[PDB]
Symmetry: C3
Subunit: 333 residues, 3 copies
């Protein structure tokens, strides 16, 4: 009986960071309350200044990672302010019934709604907008995120022993399909509604114009590179709501990978590259062993280095020459 | 010695339905006799009235699901009537030797042949036409199906306990490559032979014009929606003979999934979305827990909702508010 | 302390053959020395005489398979002769740190370098060139190979029992993106540097013009078909450095498959087709049971039979009618 359960309000954070949570549950089942505000806005997605009308949960692409435990109840208040122009909803792949909540959450501009569902299956799962007749348009305009449902006793390895992460990051990868004129130049529009027919034509080519992490080319580089120290155990959650991807840590591995993201399955070990199907969230666990810069990419290297699907880690600590060393530096011969 | 084995004649049914069979074998090994008649015909594949010359086993796209047990013998009589125009054959991925039977089954119009093979490996497997020099053309014109080889003691979960399905459906997903004129309009032809050179050009773009379940856009909707009741255990067999797909039940899960379709492997649990590689059949087991409409899609959502890869389930029974409920219905605020 | 370890010099062989090695290690850990010479050269890749400027390790596409054991040290001397025009390096997905060795191996024409790394994870792994700013161009011009790191006690099945192969072949699959003029004819260039801007445009379509095994259409056919005898256990290593593939043995199976190529995981059994993600090497084990011709393909059949991703096995021995037989040969009805 849900009225006797504890309620807890969580304030979400912007990706690639993740709100505070316990790996091993320190309470019994709870009702976990989240609020998300839909925001349609202009977004500059590349170094050339290409602009789209993005459709976001909570102002970001991707939307923020929600974290609960198995058999918690998720209660989401979804707000569509009247500064928006479109009807939106939300589908949780984590949930059972009513098109993942999509049938119960249709909100016009000026409306709100509150949905509750029980998190019966552990794993990372995609959530995305899915309004009838306009599903791929909303999703490929950035309206997707993920939710992690941890087992109550946390993550386990292939032998059933505990795996504890020191840091967690969320990487949302987004395929965009920006419309082009006859010559190949990107088109610009005053409103999202304007772009609609051109967007359908662009999607139907099945060829994205950009593929990005965290909403833009170069978003997870420089000042915004992911950080870690040698010896730290890092969990990287990665989602793609529409299209296959194949993540890879350049200079590293996935020590433990749930490529299709469901924790009741044992992880795959020692992965170089793993396939996350479109419409799925996956998770990879790695212990850093060397300092320096690492790139984290989609290993279709055209998608990575030409279309934008590349981010960086900056890792501090001590170099281990046993693992790798330059015996003779590049020289004439 | 095969002459002392029981023979049983099976009459095939049209997909998405599956002929009657026992999960757990009630007899020893048998010779299972099937007959299939090749039919080239015109097919209307979308709501706009686009027509192709389909190449079918038994008049349907996909061809019908055949069901046997491990170490049964399959004996297929394949008939190519003289109303057809092309040479056809059959390749079973279930079989060992002679290009899956392809080298032994080449039939001109007016010919027939009978092939026998032993079903030595359990799983769901693709079968498809594969005539020398024209393999992708026949396959992408609809000439493919699947065969299920059940273990003699039926399906088992990841712990080795029995999994029994109440209903089974077969979803054949088909990529078509309809040729286009300069402006983007679909071309029409009087005979299959006419389309050949244009078809090669269309295939080489690697970009399907349509992707459909059961031979047409909207085929598994409305009156032809798949049905189930809350509490029923449903097995969905899904094949794609040429191109990757990523099925997903909107509002549900794959409780037990054999994504690459081979039952000696333990299933993957609690899948949201799973990848079936091109040239493979997969299978997903689900117990319905909520009533209502569910969509079953390829979760590249452009492929689903723009190109045609979407079907429906209509599920009857009682709503369970513990799993999901609307706490505050959409309203102003 | 590495100076007390045995050193062994290995001479590499051209794919699809693999240098001599022991499955089960007959020595303790060693430093295994390899030398590779970079060669930029013209390559004819199809039956029409289309030419590209290939960038190769050791003169071949793919580069040669290197074979070591877990916890051996790999010492690679990489030579870039001054007859080349470009800067090259090497990234081993097998290695830990410095972008897989990429940051430590940048060699201009006229330079050499020697890298050492410890092979801490067992599996097959891709290696590829990855120079800063030009990663996909070098990779999709053929500059990739694989390295196998065997467990010290060799391969094991899903029950932990030994699997011993009689033959091993390496199939490198390569996506090429040859630039086209307005009409669709392939362009020719005097130097690699000439093609650069046209190549970027071609890659950005995400649509390969050719997909080949061992560097050319038809390379593994005829005189160059792979061979085996009925009863032999064959390991096929397959890599794709940039793009997904889905291998399939026509008339056979993958009895034991490590689709993502990492031997600490149990194999998948009885696969018809398996997905190797771009940026991965996989391995399939099969025991031949029937003689004759088999085709080994990427089972996107357009990619196989139109774009080039098809090779042959020629298998000798005795036909087994229990497994398959023609009951009634094709005849009028
Ligand atoms: O090793 N990364 O492309
Ligand atoms: O949740 N289906 O797109
Ligand atoms: O059965 N091979 O396409
Ligand atoms: Cu929306
Ligand atoms: Cu979805
Ligand atoms: Cu045919
Ligand atoms: Cu096939
Ligand atoms: Cu290079
Ligand atoms: Cu790489």
């Amino acid at each position: 009986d849900i009225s006797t359960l504890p309620r807890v309000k969580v304030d979400l954070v912007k990706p690639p960071f993740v709100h505070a949570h316990d790996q091993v549950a320190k309470t019994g089942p709870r009702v976990v309350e989240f609020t998300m505000t839909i925001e349609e806005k202009k977004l500059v997605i590349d170094r050339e200044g290409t602009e789209i009308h993005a459709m976001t949960f909570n102002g970001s692409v991707p939307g923020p990672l929600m974290v609960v435990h198995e058999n918690d109840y998720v209660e989401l208040r979804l707000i569509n302010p009247d500064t928006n122009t479109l009807l939106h909803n939300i589908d949780f792949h984590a949930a059972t019934g009513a098109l993942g909540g999509g049938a119960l959450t249709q909100v016009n501009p000026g409306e709100e709604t509150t949905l509750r569902f029980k998190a019966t299956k552990p794993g990372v799962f995609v959530y995305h907008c899915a309004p009838e007749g306009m599903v791929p348009w909303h999703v490929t305009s950035g309206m997707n995120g993920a939710i992690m449902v941890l087992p109550r006793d946390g993550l386990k390895d292939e032998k059933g022993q505990p795996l504890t992460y020191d840091k967690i990051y969320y990487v949302g990868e987004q395929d965009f399909y920006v419309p082009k004129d006859e010559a190949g130049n990107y088109k610009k529009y005053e409103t999202p509604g304007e772009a609609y027919e051109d967007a359908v034509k662009a999607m139907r080519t099945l060829t994205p114009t950009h593929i990005v992490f965290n909403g833009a080319v170069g978003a997870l580089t420089g000042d915004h590179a992911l950080t870690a120290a040698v010896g730290e155990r890092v969990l990287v959650v990665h989602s793609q709501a529409n299209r296959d991807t194949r993540p890879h840590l350049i200079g590293g591995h996935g020590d433990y990978v749930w490529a299709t993201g469901k924790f009741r399955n044992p992880p795959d070990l020692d992965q170089e590259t793993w396939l996350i199907p479109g419409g799925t969230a996956g998770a990879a666990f790695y212990t850093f062993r060397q300092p320096g810069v690492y790139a984290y990419v989609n290993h279709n290297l055209i998608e990575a280095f030409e279309l934008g699907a590349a981010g960086h880690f900056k890792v501090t600590g001590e170099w281990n020459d046993d693992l790798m060393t330059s015996v003779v530096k590049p020289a004439s011969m």
